Amino acid sequence: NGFTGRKITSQIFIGPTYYQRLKHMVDDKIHSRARGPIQILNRQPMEG
Amino acid sequence: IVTVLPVPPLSVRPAVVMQGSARNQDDLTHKLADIVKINNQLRRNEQNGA
RNA sequence: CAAAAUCGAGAGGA
């Protein structure tokens, strides 16, 4: 155990595996609105 | 029976501008134009003999 | 002192 150095009672299964990095990053999904622009017909917030 | 058509104000049919200045009109403004066109036309035609 | 359209199609995400 890396925090405390003591063995772990179980044996962990470990080896080399191939991973991918998918295009979906959080920096493209965080959003927040507090009184921004609004639609022209019904004065409700825009979308997106 | 419709004898006095009501014309809704500009806030129900706003005139959205272009990214330039070409002012598109609504669908409903177009339809009101067509109604007034044919209303004048039919008025003149039935006014004379037709 | 608020600047930045609409309508259709398609591909995606949970």
Annotation keywords:
part of a larger assembly; 2 chains; A: 48 residues; little secondary structure; B: 50 residues; mainly alpha; 1 helix; RNA-binding; DNA-directed RNA polymerase subunit beta (chain A); DNA-directed RNA polymerase subunit (chain B); transcription; Complex
Annotate the secondary structure layout:
This is part of a larger assembly, with chains A (48 residues) and B (50 residues).
Chain A: no helix or strand
Chain B: H1 27-47
Chain A binds one RNA strand of 14 nucleotides through residues 23-24, 29, 37, 40, 46.
Q: What is the number of strand segments of chain A? A: 0
Global shape of chain A: elongated
Helix content of chain A: under 10%
CA-CA gap between termini of chain A: 45 Å
Number of strands of chain B: 0
The sequence of SSEs of chain B as H and E is H
Helical percent range of chain B?
40-55%
Global structural class of chain A: little secondary structure
Structure overview:
- The structure is cut from a larger assembly and holds chains A (48 residues) and B (50 residues).
- Chain A is mostly loops.
- The two termini of chain A are 45 Å apart.
- Chain B is elongated and about 50 Å long.
- The chains hardly touch.
- Chain A binds one RNA strand of 14 nucleotides through residues 23-24, 29, 37, 40, 46.
Quick synopsis:
Chain A has 48 residues and is mostly loops. Chain A has no helices and no strands.
